[PDB]
Amino acid sequence: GMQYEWRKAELIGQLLNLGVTPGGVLLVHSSFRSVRPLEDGPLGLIEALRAALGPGGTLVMPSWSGLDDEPFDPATSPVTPDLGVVSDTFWRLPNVKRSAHPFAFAAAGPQAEQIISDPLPLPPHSPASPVARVHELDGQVLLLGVGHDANTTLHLAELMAKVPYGVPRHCTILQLVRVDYLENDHCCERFALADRWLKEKSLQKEGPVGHAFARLIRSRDIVATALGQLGRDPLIFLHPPEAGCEECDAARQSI
Ligand SMILES: [Cl-]
Ligand SMILES: [Zn+2]
């Protein structure tokens, strides 16, 4: 009811207290519904993120469409509604770059060109994808009002582990020429296991940003931790057949 509208300067303080590194690279998965209400809305949250990073920092967000039948255009193609209003708002602002493939990210800062430059990666989160360019630049991953099921960097860890499962997906690029690949996609619910893995090793910082429960982990810690669990169980992220997950049993089928 009478919830507090967070000011921009307050959000910067929360982000610094959470542990965001000024001048660093920060990949942010967000749900604005969790952070809301704020004064000045989603742009205010973006301005707070950019201010916490400072002029040397680079802010990165997912920015893909999800439409496998439609070609992607970095100038008009909207972000899928599942990534939130902040992601769909970030890429439209001035001087923020965007990848030129349907699995795009958006980045603004002195490092945006390096994180965005790569062509279409198959699977979408391969070692040649923006999520890997954040990892090689020692970036931070901010989970803003979302769980680890949205931690895209975990998908990169599956690919680096050479994970056995791979279901066929597809997309469209202009040369309507369908491009199918083998992706490691599932319900992603079991990604929440990484929460206990990381927090217990003291690798996950937790705190409030706005009204949201926020989690901040170094991208290298996400990959290194997950690679150890994947090295013990390549199917650690797969629901057992007992749980009867339709999205997970499909990945089990394709070896
Ligand atoms: Cl949202
Ligand atoms: Zn599942």
Residue numbers in the entry: 0 to 174, 178 to 257
Question: Which of the paper's sentences describe this entry?
Answer:
Here, we conduct a comprehensive functional analysis of the Antibiotic_NAT family of aminoglycoside acetyltransferases. AG resistance is primarily conferred by three classes of aminoglycoside-modifying enzymes (AMEs): phosphotransferases (APHs), nucleotidylyltransferases (ANTs), and acetyltransferases (AACs). AMEs permanently alter the AG substrate, preventing them from binding to their target, the A-site of the 16S rRNA in the bacterial ribosome. The fold typical of the Antibiotic_NAT family is evident in all structures, composed of 13 α-helices and 8 β-strands, and determined structures superpose with pairwise RMSD’s 0.8–1.0 Å between 197 to 266 matching Cα atoms.
Our structural data includes the crystal structure of the AAC(3)-IVa enzyme which is the first molecular image of a Group 1 Antibiotic_NAT enzyme. Our extensive structural and functional characterization demonstrates that this enzyme mediates broad-spectrum AG resistance, including to 4,5-, 4,6-disubstituted AGs and the atypical AG apramycin by evolving a more spacious active site. This is achieved by a C-terminal extension and modifications of the structure and residue composition of the α4-α5 hairpin of the minor subdomain of the enzyme which allows for broad spectrum of AG recognition. Finally, insert 4 is a C-terminal extension to the major subdomain unique to AAC(3)-IVa and forms an α-helix and a C3H1 Zn2+ binding site. We identified a Zn2+ ion binding site in the C-terminal extension of AAC(3)-IVa structure. This feature may be of only structural significance since neither this ion nor the sidechains of its cysteine and histidine ligands formed any interactions with the AGs. The binding of Zn2+ could stabilize this region and allow for orientation of the Glu249 residue for AG recognition. The Zn2+-binding residues are fully conserved across Antibiotic_NAT Group 1 representatives. The buried surface area between subunits of the AAC(3)-IVa dimer (~650 Å2) was formed nearly exclusively through interactions between the major subdomains of the two monomers of this enzyme. Collectively, these observations show that AGs can adopt multiple bound orientations facilitated by the dramatic structural changes in the minor subdomain of AAC(3)-IVa, thereby supporting broad substrate specificity for AG modification.
